Design a protein around this ligand. Structure first.
Ligand SMILES: [Mg+2]
Ligand SMILES: [Mg+2]
Ligand SMILES: [Mg+2]
Ligand SMILES: [Mg+2]
Lengths: 80, 90, 79, 91
């Protein structure tokens, strides 16, 4: 679905910013809580999940292991 | 680390439900730092000395605030994921 | 709005919403200068919308963008 | 400073049409710095020694990239403003 890495990265980055925009709208409108299926569209829940999706997609393309990264952050957290 | 476990661990450490704007501001701050790390091409998986400013760090920091905001807003990300799995299959 | 923080928070949410819509417009390559009929969803419209909220935030935060420009102009001339 | 004059002055100084992503990354970087300045309450109109990290600086920096992107994408902001002004009075 993408061969040239920078175009894949650029696409997912545009999508991340689009979902952050939709997240801003959902939070502004107070669409909090845990929706059922019928309530999911435009909920804060859906938009947070959508941002997460693109964070994970960007990690994949950038060769980032989020679990290892978390591990390192925890090491520093404990120092501090 | 399971998603629900990360969300729960973040809640134990950092949960200020009366400070919802704090978390939103921080999310946008981290998204900006992420933009910088991508522009500068700081990709790959860093060792501890390379961590600061890396794409890896900034992605993790965005993730942290997504989870912290989920806790603030009464969202179960793992359950929301399950729900999204259903819709995207339609 | 009477209470300034709520005004600021509203405009900041709107700014982020418009930056998202801008990202979509650029991704889709909706460049150029639209006619009235092509305006909706154009890069032009989203840039203007982002600008609107920048100016709205300047107002609420007591920022003079003309004066700020003048100051930046100076510093830039040393770079 | 007219909006059209600001846009054209920025074009004179900084116009790299083959670097469209540069400008978009920078816009998002400035929006994040704006978020920080607002969270920290760095409001008002700063003097020169107060400028760095101020809400004023970050708002100007976002404005700069909005104008720079307009140049990149063939957008006339003043004309766009006029078109939006037309629609706003209608509804
Ligand atoms: Mg969405
Ligand atoms: Mg960071
Ligand atoms: Mg818009
Ligand atoms: Mg700045």
């Amino acid at each position: 679905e993408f061969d040239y890495a920078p175009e894949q990265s650029e696409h997912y980055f545009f999508k991340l910013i689009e979902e952050v925009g939709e997240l801003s709208e959902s939070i502004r409108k107070g669409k909090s809580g845990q929706p059922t299926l019928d309530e999911l569209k435009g909920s804060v829940a859906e938009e947070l999940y959508d941002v997460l999706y693109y964070v994970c997609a960007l990690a994949n393309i950038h060769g980032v292991n989020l679990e290892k990264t978390h591990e390192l952050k925890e090491v520093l957290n404990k120092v501090k």
